[model samples]
Target: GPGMGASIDDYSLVHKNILHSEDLLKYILETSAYPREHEQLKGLREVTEKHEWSSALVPADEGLFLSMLLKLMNAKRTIEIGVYTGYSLLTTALALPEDGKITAIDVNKSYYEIGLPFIQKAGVEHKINFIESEALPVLDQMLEEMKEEDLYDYAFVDADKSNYANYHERLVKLVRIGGAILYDNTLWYGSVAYPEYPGLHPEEEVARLSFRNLNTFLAADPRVEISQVSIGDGVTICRRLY
Candidate 1:
């Protein structure tokens, strides 16, 4: 109950979806995700579990989902907009080829340090380029500095909710045509679908409104095809179509 704006237990009331049954989500995890999780991934997860804002970390099932997506696309170059403790970042690192690379950014440095050792232990630390700064200008600079061969095959954004729209705009151009860009927590603790949730704190309230607007904007945008998933606070996948 200490880090950022909310704690893991904030889900006790807010995170009810699981798309339906908690037992079913549990069944899926026990049967597939955890049993197949990489040792270093499990290790970072254990370390992050003790952190005050463990709730912000991506869950194991979602990590595996992103891993599978990366490999299926043979994605070699990627960018991560938020690397909270590097759970998803490590997932990307391990899923990538020996020569693959990840450009990961986070405004917070201490949190990334917490998971760095496990990433090093996993031996894919070379695949990552972690940047400490606000993602937009970093993203802007990346776009300017990039060459033809440097276009990212995939991108994942899980940072400040209010900036999702702006990130969506830039990534649409930065990631190559037909490349994928996933915006995490697009459902924002299920608050996007809720009707005027009064229990939400100020941060959560702002985030909820942001996602609601983003979901609408993405739906109508013709540049990329979109799918809003039920997995892990709802990941919205948009593939560049132009």
Candidate 2:
């Protein structure tokens, strides 16, 4: 007498075992998979959840993949708009040179503290400058005090949904010409193309709407060369020219 609800398993917030369409995932994985790299990141992501955090946290594999992608592009300076528990921060830090740095922003210190261990374990603590505050204010301060060399070679934005436009605006200045910005969760668990369910929460709706707009915005943005890669939860990579 096992019902569907009772049989459902929650892997991540979207229920990776059930709600997530793994058949599609498997096809992508086999076609363009980085097994060792994915495993390393997957291990870290799995480990992070046990420390008591939300499922919205970026998985480590994708984080590491983004970092390596930036490194391959010869990125020397980078930033992360949101750094909950620092998995992405750790990956970026480890990818960069000794002098490379990441300006990691977050609103919660307690969650950040949890990820400090892995970051320190990777021996890249000095590469990060953690700022516990709202995202836009810090970006504004950076712009106001713009040094001639204050250009970011790469950036990752995965913070508040409604403010994604705000982050995108500022990132254009920070990311250098030919440099890229990786925006995560662009697919919103396949919610963008689907009609809203009556039971969907407001926050979920906001995310869905925001990502739809972002997709259109990127398509129309002439300042950057953009491409929507079907990476983890969909990553939109934009290479700025202006």
Candidate 3:
């Protein structure tokens, strides 16, 4: 009964759940081998969901995926650009070893503060270097200081959509060869596949264009092997080959 579904269906229009059925998505999360949340993650989720920009946060499943990826790759040194309220940061912190470190950057300090208590409670505060400034300049500084390429084992880009490509250019240099760089919201709420999804608003139109441009750019980049996963808003994972 759980796995049953219509013989033919295109449920992509269902925005609430990428799997297209709320019950089915719930089932997958429930039956998965990984436990979805603990006390700290649950608390962080509660705080973030109340925020006005709550929708910008990655879904629970995506957070779990990030944790799983980090463990699988044995990633220790990671970079998280565009940390909205530290949900992903907390997830990354939990997945890493005791000495693991993350460079977390966000333009707004207040947003991060909302999750700071939870992070402190989790006792992973020492692992994170929180920066309250524009992400681009910080990335540029990392690039300038790099004595050799591939210093980072992993990187996650989920900040300003307009700068996705710009971030990728710098991230490629910072992430080690064969390391991963995950770009969140790459599907842009499915706007890249269907431009009309965002409607005709000027701001939405600009976002649509940005998603389109970055999708094409990532597809063409030879330095990384990519896989566009249909999860959350959609995550495009690029594994640097060179």
Task: Return the lDDT, model 1, position 127.
Answer: 94
Show model 3 residue runs off by greater than 4 Å.
1-17, 30-35, 195-200
Which candidate ranks first by lDDT, i.e. highest?
A: 1
Superposed Cα RMSD, model 3: 7.7
Provide the lDDT at 122 for model 1: 96
Clashing pairs in 1: none
Q: Give the TM-score comparing model 3 with the true structure, all chains together.
A: 0.88
Best of the candidates, TM-score: 1
Please, what is the TM-score per model? Answer: 0.93, 0.84, 0.88
- In model 2, the number of clashes is 1
Query: Which whole-number lDDT from 0 to 100 does residue 213 have in model 1?
Result: 91
**Judged by lDDT relative to the true structure, which candidate is superior, 2 or 3?**
3
For model 2 the TM-score comes to 0.84
Query: What digit string (tens of lDDT, one per residue) describes model 3 on residues 1-242?
Result: 00122221322322454566778777766676136675787788888777756667777788888999999999999999988778899999999999999999988878888888999999999999998888889999988897664399999888876678889889999999999999987776666776456333444456568888888888999999999999887889999999
When sorted by TM-score, best at the front, the candidate numbers are 1, 3, 2
Write the residue-wise lDDT of candidate 2 on 59-149 in tens digits.
Answer: 5446657867977897778888877777777778878998888899877776677778777767788988899888899999988887748
